[PDB]
């Protein structure tokens, strides 16, 4: 129906947060993902960006 | 690499006063608070202040309050505590340390600590009085012999044996303070107790702040 | 002025195992606890902030979580390195108070200690004073004390007791305790001794004199 394209900018140890069912300072506090969650997580180092 | 390199520690009379300063290197100070904290000898860490270096405001422990005073320096990039009317209660080695903004952060970054004393002993140097060994069968067939470093002001106080020649069976405990104002600490010598009327087992206690030392021959008594 | 209630008070774990330390707020402090090791000689470094964030430079074995108002420090598996005693501080508003701190130990095997007695000599007592002292050598774990008596009673509110740092190898430590008396109160007893007391010892040692035996 729709498709939504979320994004934000993280540290190397967070991006392991970043998928439905967990916890620690961005899974509780600043963004989350439901149980029953459809879709797909991708991350990557912009270090020279 | 980030460096806290503290100074300015030292021997303070009651009722006088002490100047502390922490520089900065790697790091500057603004958007971060600047942090003092107290560990007193023998006992864990205390909160004495805090100052926003983006600020200017502070904010103070109950158990400093009135009495110190703290303060940073962009330009200098450099913290500092000054310490009035300092008192016994005070001893302790005074540390300084950073965190983020204001508050709800915890301090990462820590300087090694720098210790000033205060007593109504401004100082004293230490005595040494014998322990004798036991002269009953003991387990090991081993014996030790030692002494008792006592009376004398500040910590700390260095102990070996045989003038730093026995360094082998020596066990020294770190001094605690006595009614007297002044420090104390006792040690031994532990071998086969036919080595206690062979080898030399003399207690050196040595304390670098008064230039000062002792050199205690410690025997079996005949008992 | 938030206190923070530590436990267990010290903790025995090997090397390879697992250590669990929790820290208790008397209020609400949010998630702003942070968590500290310190060696002897050095700083406290930073070990976790904001209550589950690993700080830089700090092995990923410390860890930690919270349920409900529980906070624990996890260290995954102890290394050699790992035995501190470790502190909690709150940093969500001031004043920061820090609490006691709790002591992890290498759980070594347990032994009894090679004890000796020094009654007060003729030398000692030319002070106007008298020191009974009893050494304990070289035993584990941390935990101990002396038991005093006097003519075969309990003594208290009487003796002082001295604990030194734990060896770099085995971890061993003495402990040492003395009775405080004035010559004239040393004049008024026969009989002392000194009543060993630890987890490694099955059978307390009992050391003691009369009054001017050596």
């Known amino acids: 129906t729709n498709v939504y394209a979320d994004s934000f900018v993280i540290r190397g140890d967070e991006v392991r947060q970043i998928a439905p069912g967990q916890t620690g300072k961005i899974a509780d506090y600043n963004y989350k993902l439901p149980d029953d969650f459809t879709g797909c997580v991708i991350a990557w180092n912009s270090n020279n960006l | 690499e980030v460096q806290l390199v503290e100074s300015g520690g030292g021997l303070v009379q009651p009722g006088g006063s002490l100047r502390l300063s922490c520089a900065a290197s790697?790091?500057?100070?603004?958007?971060?608070?600047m942090h003092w904290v107290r560990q007193a000898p023998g006992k864990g860490l205390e909160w004495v202040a805090g100052?926003?270096?983006?600020?200017?405001?502070?904010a103070y422990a109950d158990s400093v309050k009135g009495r110190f005073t703290i303060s940073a320096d962009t330009s200098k990039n450099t913290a500092y505590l000054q310490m009035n009317s300092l008192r016994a209660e005070d001893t302790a080695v005074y540390y300084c340390?950073?965190?983020?903004?204001?508050?709800?952060?915890?301090?990462?970054?820590w300087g090694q600590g720098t210790l000033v004393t205060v007593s109504s002993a401004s100082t004293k140097g230490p005595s040494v009085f014998p322990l004798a060994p036991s002269s009953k069968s003991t387990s090991g067939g081993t014996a030790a012999l030692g002494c008792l470093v006592k009376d004398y002001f500040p910590e700390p106080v260095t102990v070996s044996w045989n003038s730093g020649a026995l360094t082998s069976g020596v066990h020294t405990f770190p001094a605690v303070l006595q009614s007297s104002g002044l420090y104390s600490l006792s040690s031994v010598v532990t071998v086969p107790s036919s080595s206690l009327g062979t080898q030399t087992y003399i207690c050196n206690v040595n304390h670098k702040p008064s230039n000062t030392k002792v050199d205690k021959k410690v025997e079996p008594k005949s008992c | 002025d938030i206190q923070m209630t530590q436990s267990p008070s010290s903790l025995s774990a090997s090397v390879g195992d697992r250590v669990t330390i929790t820290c208790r707020a008397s209020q609400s402090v949010s998630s702003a606890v942070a968590w500290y090791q310190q060696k002897p000689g050095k700083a406290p470094k930073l070990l976790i902030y904001s209550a589950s964030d690993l700080y830089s430079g700090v092995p990923s074995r410390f860890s930690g979580s919270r349920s409900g108002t529980d906070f624990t420090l996890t260290i995954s598996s102890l290394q050699p390195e790992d035995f501190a005693t470790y502190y909690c501080?709150?940093?969500?508003?001031?004043?920061?108070?820090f609490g006691q701190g709790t002591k992890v130990e290498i759980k070594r095997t347990v032994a009894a200690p090679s004890v000796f007695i020094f009654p007060p000599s003729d030398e000692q007592l030319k002070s106007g004073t008298a020191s009974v002292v009893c050494l304990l050598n070289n035993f584990y774990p941390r935990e101990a004390k002396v038991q005093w008596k006097v003519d075969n009673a309990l003594q208290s509110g009487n003796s002082q007791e001295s604990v030194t740092e734990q060896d770099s190898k085995d971890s061993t430590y003495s402990l040492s305790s003395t009775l405080t008396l004035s010559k004239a109160d040393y004049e008024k007893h026969k009989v002392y001794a000194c009543e060993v007391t630890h987890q490694g010892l099955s059978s307390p040692v009992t050391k003691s004199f009369n009054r001017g035996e050596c």
């Open positions: 790697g790091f500057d100070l603004g958007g971060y608070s």
């Open positions: 501080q709150q940093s969500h508003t001031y004043p920061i108070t």
């Open positions: 340390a950073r965190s983020y903004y204001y508050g709800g952060f915890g301090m990462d970054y």
């Open positions: 100052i926003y270096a983006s600020g200017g405001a502070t």
